[model samples]
Target: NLKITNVKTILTAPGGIDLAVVKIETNEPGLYGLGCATFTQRIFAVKSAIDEYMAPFLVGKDPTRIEDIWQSGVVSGYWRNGPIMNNALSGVDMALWDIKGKLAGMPVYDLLGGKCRDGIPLYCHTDGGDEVEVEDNIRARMEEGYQYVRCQMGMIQPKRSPRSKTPGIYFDPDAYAKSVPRLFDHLRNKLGFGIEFIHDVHERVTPVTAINLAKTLEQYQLFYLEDPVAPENIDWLKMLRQQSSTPISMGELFVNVNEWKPLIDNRLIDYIRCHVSTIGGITPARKLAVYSELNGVRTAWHGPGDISPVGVCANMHLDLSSPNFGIQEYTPMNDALRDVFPGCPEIDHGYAYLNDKPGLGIDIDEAKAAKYPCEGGIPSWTMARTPDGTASRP
Candidate 1:
């Protein structure tokens, strides 16, 4: 019979990817749960969406009515499914699930059904500016026990940066179509089929080139080719299925139902690579997992470097329950970032052990959080410019 008593936001930027964490305090004595609403570049907007908006609605309500809370929160602003609203709703929904897990005295996976797998496999990035260095980098991580390596010698090579002298535009579709196949050939010839390889096109090319890349990459048999073309033109995804069997991973830039449905329902992509936090936390993410199982698309939750520990565990719970779980993208956190938000999933070899006591299996040190001075507006490090001095996608 525990009800939500209060709610608050913990704003911190340990390394500039500010975390606007949400906490739902319940009336069951001192019980509460932490959830991440870390929006990276748009942290403050989500914080306001939470403390100024979501908190008031969640306060003085039934914390256990997870579905009711989730649905109501989604429409509270009347403009549903926007990233700010979705992220805010995600924070509260995730916290409620955490509370439910604690009350049941079990992990979130148990409530969701039960664990379908022991360890969640993860993939690490290898970027060294060129193929030789990229090979060496992959070898280094392979030596460290990583089985899946995301190979890249400049995910997109700069084509131009004339006006600002920054050399921002690092991609030319024609150039990449030629270079990429050779890179994979080298991996297959030298590294062999034992190690799994993933190449991210980063949506820097056209649908035709993406298909060509997929056709070219079929020989290597990659883990997946991610974002072959930008998701803005989602219908382009359908083209891949017709042309090649290269195993596609799309949806990292998704926010709407329309964008994901064709890919998930139609089975246009082999993997669903959405960032769970932005898609609306465990509630909707779980729904997507079920749909993926039905449609044959597998889960490969986006685990970028800036995701807070809470967000990662939120992803972990969803990953553990889904039968269609694929590989997770691991964005390594620094020691300083780790100390403040401790209790991450136990990563041994390349798999993250999905056991960590109750709830999301993580917590944040508010004191340490306070130390990271954050006012807001941190631009993303990813940059781009075209050869003709025009701005381009990064």
Candidate 2:
């Protein structure tokens, strides 16, 4: 039996994004494992949760009792299922899975039920300043063997420019809803029907606008139109799905089960995009994948660059075992980031491949991680608002 001896945080800015990774040490020498506690925007919150709360409670327990440990942390605080509770619990669960897999000398995917398929299909992000530029970027990736892609047309309104009076957050939801469909109209006309494309409204539009957007883009045969309206309104999803057959993917910003269950049980969305680390680790994540299959929904887990190498590989392992797996949002880590975390999941032409190594198939250099301490200033897109200063949703 491997008894947990210690747990601590190693804050790092691999590629300048704060990754609050956890290392759970066992009584057995050279048998410790890593987990990603990287709620990047809330690194400090997760750190406090893991170090002050979860870590202390977990020490001296059997590291192999993953579910027993998971059940305790998830609800023991009397307040489970928030970002901090889930993220902290996630790191511990990941470490437990790592230890379990190591003890058995198999990769985590094998531990999850072996390979369901050869590898997971990956989709990449392509952005450009204009339609011409965006098309160029798409063609470039197509040549690189990526069939599915998420294309971001550069911000229509220049940031911090003379074009707008209140420039902090400026957007017109109606205009966005309309312009995006026209963009796809032009795209499909430019490149005939061999490619699959995804567009993210990021829940920035109202229900009517979202319905209109879905109806307009239906002819283009998009792979999915993402989060047209926020998950706050399930009726909006029903409205869109009723009006058009354009596929939908939601839950990128989800942390509540109430928000997701309605979508899954009702077949409201085509894919669910929960971040594993955000929802509390491999245990529930794998469960979510299986649950999605029951509801005819597929899994398109969130895999942003901010997630550590451990999180990325953990995600890939889920995809390998999930029969309902749809696609992975691939955020190629910089070589500098890869070098700091020596062994990590690798991306081939357009697929994410798992290493045959035991456990998570990843490791970190604490000395290297120390060089770039957590600063908690990872950049993100500005929230959407009208020129009139009314805050909008996304």
Candidate 3:
């Protein structure tokens, strides 16, 4: 039995963004793994949760039995699935799996039954405040060999509240209602229909507005429309689905299977986009993917940089193994960040190829990591409002 030894939390700011990093060590031969659970600007909360509650439970367990350890720590707490708790548990779960794969001398994907494809196709975000800029960015991405792109023009505005002091661009349903046709028409005319385009509403619209925008963009042949409405009201998604033929996708903010089940079961969404860190690590995420696959929905794991390098490596393994993978989000980590957690999977023509190295296939350079101590103030929340000074969601 491999006895767990030390669990240390290191806080770092690689891209000038606060990240809560956790490392678990074991007494087993050549055993240890790195896991990341970052709350973006809310790093301290997650850090404290892991150090105070989760770490104690994992001290002496067998690192090889990742699933068992995950369940023990996750279910042991009656108040299980909230963001702070699950994110904390996610870090530990991922680390345990990394250690398991290393011990067995195989990549995490191989342990999950081998690769599903030669490579995992990735999607990157392209943004512009106007038609010209949007068109230019799309052209650049296309030149870079991106087959799939999430297009955002930064013009949509949500309805604003009467009082607030936040200043920035906002989401407007009416503006989006107009922007969709204009943006897609330009793209289709300039680049043709071979390249797939996706739009993220960012949960900024009402159900009616979401449906309307979807209807307007149907002529553009979008690959999917993400977060048309918030995930809270699952029933609202069904309403939007009934009104629009555009393939709907959501769940980047979801932390567990319960949030994904209703949407998948009812066929309200054609794509489910849960991130590895946000969805309770590999065990719960794999279960959620299986459940989604059974219902004919494809898995599109979210891959924003807010997830640490360790988290990204873990997700790559899962993506390589899952049969229903649709598209993955890719944001290249800064050089400093990459230095701390080296050996990430390779990116070729916008697709990530898995390496055969053991564990999550990476080594964390603690000395380099320690150099970049956590610097607070990575904006976790952004505010928006109308021209008249009313509050709005950004």
Candidate 4:
């Protein structure tokens, strides 16, 4: 048993994107684990939750009691699940697992019962406002040797709420519906069936509109249509599943298994896209995976900049171990951001592999991290609206 000595929390902006990093130190020589609990705008809240509450309880405990400590934290906090709470717990959970894996002198995947796949394939997003841009970006991705690509068409209205802040152009459902066939027509014309295509609705339409759009794109053989409807209701998803052959995927915002149960059991979605940081940790996420797999749903863990480096490592390990692994969303952080976390896994041909190194095989660059402390910025969500400014539900 290694005595927990000190815990350090740092908020850093790597490549101008903010992330929260936590370091747990043990009494054993050269023994420490790093975790990231990035809540975007809620970074400080996660840090405080760790320092003022979780870290103190962790002091002097056996570092290898990873699962026990995870339960203790969950039971200790009756509120239990939310983005902030789960993100904090996720950081600690990942660090503990890192230490345990290091102690065992094996990779984290090995501790999770070994690799179930040769390697995990990842998919990245490519955006364009018009068919031309979409075609161009798809070509670029193919040039980069990406077999699977997620595409976002440009928005129709240029001055919309969320679209204004985001990178791509906006398209209304009617226009998007028409454009879907054209986009895929061009894709098949250009890249053909050998390359896979996925679409992100970003919850930008009504259920009817989502269904209409899905039907239009069905001929193209999409990999899946993701987050087409708001996650607040599962009934709409069930309806969507009944109406469309386009594989449905959602649940990045889900914080607990209860939220995903009905949807999975009903087979409302073909893929589950939850995150390790949001779902508590490896333990709960693995449970979710098993449950979903039993229902014929595949696991597609969400990966984005909002997921810190440590969270990414945890996701990689889980993806490595899960038999029903689908596609991983791979958004490479900027170079400066990547440098902030040492021991990052390599990405080749759109797949990330696990190294045989002990623990999560991650190291934190504290000095670089301190340079970009938390500036208190959070991600904001808004619905697309009509010309008269009436809010449109996606």
Which of the two, 1 or 3, has more TM-score? Answer: 1
- Where in model 4 is the C-alpha error above 4 Å? 155-174, 378-384, 391-394
Off by over 4 Å in 3: 154-171, 378-381, 386-394
Ranking by TM-score: 2, 1, 3, 4
lDDT of every model, 2 decimals: 0.82, 0.84, 0.79, 0.78
Ranking by lDDT: 2, 1, 3, 4
Candidate 1, overall lDDT? Answer: 0.82
How much is the lDDT of residue 183 in candidate 1?
Answer: 81
Quote the lDDT for 142 in model 1. Answer: 90
Worst 10 residues of 1 by lDDT: 153-162
Better of 3 and 4 by TM-score: 3
Q: What would the per-residue lDDT of candidate 4 be over residues 214-278, giving only the tens digit for each residue? A: 88888888998988877776568766767789888888878866778989988888899887777
Q: Count the clashes in each prediction.
A: 5, 0, 6, 10
lDDT of each residue in 20-118, candidate 1, tens digit only: 778889888868988877777788788888888887787789888999988888888888877777888888888888888888888888888889898
Pick the TM-score winner. Answer: 2
- Whole-model lDDT for model 2 versus the true structure? 0.84
| Per-model TM-score versus the true fold | 0.94, 0.95, 0.93, 0.91
Residue pair clashes in candidate 4: 41-377, 41-378, 129-154, 154-169, 155-169, 155-170, 155-171, 156-170, 156-171, 205-394
Q: Write down the TM-score for model 4.
A: 0.91
**Per-residue lDDT of 3 in model 2:** 91
